[PDB]
GROMACS .gro file of C-alpha atoms in nm:
model
  202
    1UNK     CA    1  -1.727   0.540  -0.163
    2UNK     CA    2  -1.440   0.792  -0.206
    3UNK     CA    3  -1.223   0.484  -0.154
    4UNK     CA    4  -0.905   0.573  -0.346
    5UNK     CA    5  -0.543   0.461  -0.320
    6UNK     CA    6  -0.200   0.627  -0.297
    7UNK     CA    7  -0.123   0.538  -0.657
    8UNK     CA    8  -0.437   0.702  -0.788
    9UNK     CA    9  -0.383   1.009  -0.572
   10UNK     CA   10  -0.030   1.051  -0.684
   11UNK     CA   11  -0.115   1.010  -1.054
   12UNK     CA   12  -0.322   1.329  -1.031
   13UNK     CA   13   0.011   1.518  -0.981
   14UNK     CA   14   0.168   1.702  -1.274
   15UNK     CA   15   0.524   1.702  -1.414
   16UNK     CA   16   0.733   1.937  -1.206
   17UNK     CA   17   0.541   1.863  -0.891
   18UNK     CA   18   0.768   1.765  -0.597
   19UNK     CA   19   0.771   1.714  -0.222
   20UNK     CA   20   1.038   1.661   0.038
   21UNK     CA   21   0.945   1.409   0.327
   22UNK     CA   22   1.115   1.371   0.650
   23UNK     CA   23   1.141   1.067   0.884
   24UNK     CA   24   1.360   1.201   1.162
   25UNK     CA   25   1.706   1.214   1.018
   26UNK     CA   26   1.613   1.079   0.667
   27UNK     CA   27   1.499   1.313   0.392
   28UNK     CA   28   1.334   1.198   0.057
   29UNK     CA   29   1.293   1.419  -0.246
   30UNK     CA   30   1.008   1.305  -0.472
   31UNK     CA   31   0.976   1.447  -0.824
   32UNK     CA   32   0.709   1.391  -1.097
   33UNK     CA   33   0.906   1.381  -1.419
   34UNK     CA   34   0.670   1.279  -1.690
   35UNK     CA   35   0.303   1.178  -1.720
   36UNK     CA   36   0.118   1.022  -2.005
   37UNK     CA   37  -0.200   0.814  -2.032
   38UNK     CA   38   0.042   0.514  -2.036
   39UNK     CA   39   0.299   0.589  -1.763
   40UNK     CA   40   0.399   0.833  -1.491
   41UNK     CA   41   0.770   0.858  -1.398
   42UNK     CA   42   0.857   0.949  -1.039
   43UNK     CA   43   1.210   1.006  -0.921
   44UNK     CA   44   1.300   0.958  -0.545
   45UNK     CA   45   1.631   1.069  -0.394
   46UNK     CA   46   1.734   0.972  -0.040
   47UNK     CA   47   1.953   1.159   0.193
   48UNK     CA   48   2.032   1.076   0.552
   49UNK     CA   49   2.212   1.391   0.656
   50UNK     CA   50   2.304   1.721   0.512
   51UNK     CA   51   2.613   1.937   0.563
   52UNK     CA   52   2.576   2.197   0.833
   53UNK     CA   53   2.718   2.417   0.558
   54UNK     CA   54   2.458   2.294   0.302
   55UNK     CA   55   2.166   2.356   0.550
   56UNK     CA   56   2.249   2.726   0.475
   57UNK     CA   57   2.173   2.703   0.110
   58UNK     CA   58   1.827   2.560   0.189
   59UNK     CA   59   1.714   2.821   0.442
   60UNK     CA   60   1.848   3.083   0.202
   61UNK     CA   61   1.622   2.952  -0.073
   62UNK     CA   62   1.446   2.615  -0.082
   63UNK     CA   63   1.497   2.252  -0.122
   64UNK     CA   64   1.396   2.281  -0.485
   65UNK     CA   65   1.635   2.564  -0.561
   66UNK     CA   66   1.931   2.435  -0.356
   67UNK     CA   67   1.893   2.071  -0.462
   68UNK     CA   68   2.159   2.095  -0.740
   69UNK     CA   69   2.424   2.181  -0.467
   70UNK     CA   70   2.388   1.890  -0.218
   71UNK     CA   71   2.666   1.639  -0.162
   72UNK     CA   72   2.256   0.927  -0.159
   73UNK     CA   73   2.043   0.660  -0.332
   74UNK     CA   74   1.829   0.758  -0.638
   75UNK     CA   75   1.532   0.559  -0.759
   76UNK     CA   76   1.318   0.608  -1.071
   77UNK     CA   77   0.973   0.462  -1.078
   78UNK     CA   78   0.764   0.394  -1.382
   79UNK     CA   79   0.407   0.363  -1.280
   80UNK     CA   80   0.146   0.231  -1.530
   81UNK     CA   81  -0.145  -0.023  -1.573
   82UNK     CA   82   0.144  -0.275  -1.570
   83UNK     CA   83   0.348  -0.387  -1.276
   84UNK     CA   84   0.574  -0.129  -1.118
   85UNK     CA   85   0.927  -0.100  -1.271
   86UNK     CA   86   1.201   0.056  -1.071
   87UNK     CA   87   1.546   0.175  -1.163
   88UNK     CA   88   1.847   0.275  -0.967
   89UNK     CA   89   2.105   0.531  -1.076
   90UNK     CA   90   2.441   0.357  -1.130
   91UNK     CA   91   2.727   0.531  -1.312
   92UNK     CA   92   2.501   0.786  -1.485
   93UNK     CA   93   2.256   0.518  -1.620
   94UNK     CA   94   1.913   0.408  -1.502
   95UNK     CA   95   1.966   0.049  -1.419
   96UNK     CA   96   1.674  -0.184  -1.374
   97UNK     CA   97   1.617  -0.358  -1.037
   98UNK     CA   98   1.563  -0.727  -1.004
   99UNK     CA   99   1.759  -0.743  -0.663
  100UNK     CA  100   1.414  -0.667  -0.521
  101UNK     CA  101   1.544  -0.463  -0.221
  102UNK     CA  102   1.297  -0.166  -0.217
  103UNK     CA  103   1.075  -0.305  -0.495
  104UNK     CA  104   0.801  -0.464  -0.277
  105UNK     CA  105   0.792  -0.190  -0.024
  106UNK     CA  106   0.704   0.063  -0.299
  107UNK     CA  107   0.431  -0.151  -0.443
  108UNK     CA  108   0.274  -0.183  -0.103
  109UNK     CA  109   0.274   0.189  -0.049
  110UNK     CA  110   0.119   0.244  -0.394
  111UNK     CA  111  -0.153  -0.009  -0.320
  112UNK     CA  112  -0.248   0.137   0.029
  113UNK     CA  113  -0.614   0.225   0.027
  114UNK     CA  114  -0.751   0.563   0.129
  115UNK     CA  115  -1.095   0.645   0.272
  116UNK     CA  116  -1.201   0.969   0.445
  117UNK     CA  117  -1.158   0.982   0.821
  118UNK     CA  118  -1.162   1.235   1.103
  119UNK     CA  119  -0.853   1.424   1.199
  120UNK     CA  120  -0.659   1.297   1.489
  121UNK     CA  121  -0.377   1.561   1.478
  122UNK     CA  122  -0.475   1.663   1.836
  123UNK     CA  123  -0.606   1.432   2.115
  124UNK     CA  124  -0.842   1.612   2.354
  125UNK     CA  125  -0.897   1.461   2.690
  126UNK     CA  126   0.635   2.757  -0.674
  127UNK     CA  127   0.737   2.623  -0.320
  128UNK     CA  128   0.580   2.589   0.029
  129UNK     CA  129   0.825   2.516   0.297
  130UNK     CA  130   0.759   2.476   0.669
  131UNK     CA  131   0.484   2.347   0.897
  132UNK     CA  132   0.275   2.223   0.612
  133UNK     CA  133   0.018   2.040   0.837
  134UNK     CA  134  -0.121   2.387   0.914
  135UNK     CA  135  -0.252   2.407   0.564
  136UNK     CA  136  -0.624   2.324   0.516
  137UNK     CA  137  -0.642   1.946   0.504
  138UNK     CA  138  -0.853   1.636   0.538
  139UNK     CA  139  -0.755   1.303   0.675
  140UNK     CA  140  -0.760   0.961   0.512
  141UNK     CA  141  -0.740   0.632   0.692
  142UNK     CA  142  -0.534   0.337   0.550
  143UNK     CA  143  -0.391   0.012   0.673
  144UNK     CA  144  -0.065  -0.170   0.597
  145UNK     CA  145  -0.098  -0.514   0.441
  146UNK     CA  146  -0.060  -0.833   0.649
  147UNK     CA  147   0.310  -0.918   0.601
  148UNK     CA  148   0.634  -1.011   0.769
  149UNK     CA  149   0.719  -0.664   0.911
  150UNK     CA  150   0.635  -0.459   1.219
  151UNK     CA  151   0.392  -0.258   0.999
  152UNK     CA  152   0.183  -0.565   0.937
  153UNK     CA  153  -0.183  -0.477   0.959
  154UNK     CA  154  -0.097  -0.140   1.130
  155UNK     CA  155  -0.338   0.159   1.096
  156UNK     CA  156  -0.224   0.461   0.896
  157UNK     CA  157  -0.350   0.817   0.893
  158UNK     CA  158  -0.255   1.038   0.587
  159UNK     CA  159  -0.347   1.411   0.550
  160UNK     CA  160  -0.380   1.578   0.208
  161UNK     CA  161  -0.432   1.938   0.122
  162UNK     CA  162  -0.795   2.030   0.037
  163UNK     CA  163  -0.645   2.176  -0.282
  164UNK     CA  164  -0.625   1.881  -0.522
  165UNK     CA  165  -0.348   2.057  -0.702
  166UNK     CA  166  -0.116   1.959  -0.409
  167UNK     CA  167  -0.117   1.584  -0.466
  168UNK     CA  168   0.153   1.472  -0.221
  169UNK     CA  169   0.066   1.405   0.144
  170UNK     CA  170   0.117   1.680   0.417
  171UNK     CA  171   0.165   1.432   0.704
  172UNK     CA  172   0.160   1.056   0.757
  173UNK     CA  173   0.122   0.888   1.091
  174UNK     CA  174   0.162   0.506   1.130
  175UNK     CA  175   0.110   0.278   1.435
  176UNK     CA  176   0.404   0.056   1.503
  177UNK     CA  177   0.504  -0.171   1.794
  178UNK     CA  178   0.778   0.085   1.894
  179UNK     CA  179   0.503   0.350   1.901
  180UNK     CA  180   0.367   0.598   1.641
  181UNK     CA  181   0.580   0.716   1.352
  182UNK     CA  182   0.546   1.042   1.161
  183UNK     CA  183   0.666   1.113   0.816
  184UNK     CA  184   0.653   1.483   0.774
  185UNK     CA  185   0.630   1.683   0.449
  186UNK     CA  186   0.863   1.982   0.496
  187UNK     CA  187   0.840   2.132   0.137
  188UNK     CA  188   0.627   2.078  -0.165
  189UNK     CA  189   0.564   2.270  -0.488
  190UNK     CA  190   0.569   2.294  -0.867
  191UNK     CA  191   0.788   2.351  -1.165
  192UNK     CA  192   1.080   2.159  -1.038
  193UNK     CA  193   1.330   2.021  -1.295
  194UNK     CA  194   1.530   1.701  -1.245
  195UNK     CA  195   1.901   1.724  -1.185
  196UNK     CA  196   1.950   1.362  -1.299
  197UNK     CA  197   1.995   1.190  -1.647
  198UNK     CA  198   1.705   1.183  -1.878
  199UNK     CA  199   1.448   0.914  -1.878
  200UNK     CA  200   1.497   0.561  -2.014
  201UNK     CA  201   1.441   0.542  -2.394
  202UNK     CA  202   1.225   0.249  -2.487
   0.00000   0.00000   0.00000
């Protein structure tokens, strides 16, 4: 009934909205750059490690404000009624992808369904940086598609702030064969500006 999807939920975000997600050692910076009735552009930068000297800039301010000072792959997503289009940054230009390396993974995530579900955070028997799962939240159940990966048909639990103005997830937990996996949101906020080249001109 409140059946939604990750694409639908993220399209409620506004330009300048951002979030930093963590999967152990990996860090991903998501930024909403432009939104029209026809397309929403989302930039995604990966890091796998930060300089012990660069960790100091972040604690001293924030991911958003220290970002322009970090020594990564950079993707640009154009989300529309039409099929997803992805670009990678190569020599200061947004280059289209047809070497479908991350392309199908992204489309899967965007298609993931969301329905309301009870919290399982505990088993009983502008910027915001820190332990964001302590924010007021509600849980949403999803399931990965049947496919050729360990994630195939695995259950997903995604937490979102009760404040719809915060459109990125707070916390994502996914069953796998190795055991459960947590993608943690360590910072989210508003009014971020891209450090990368301007959007493709069509």
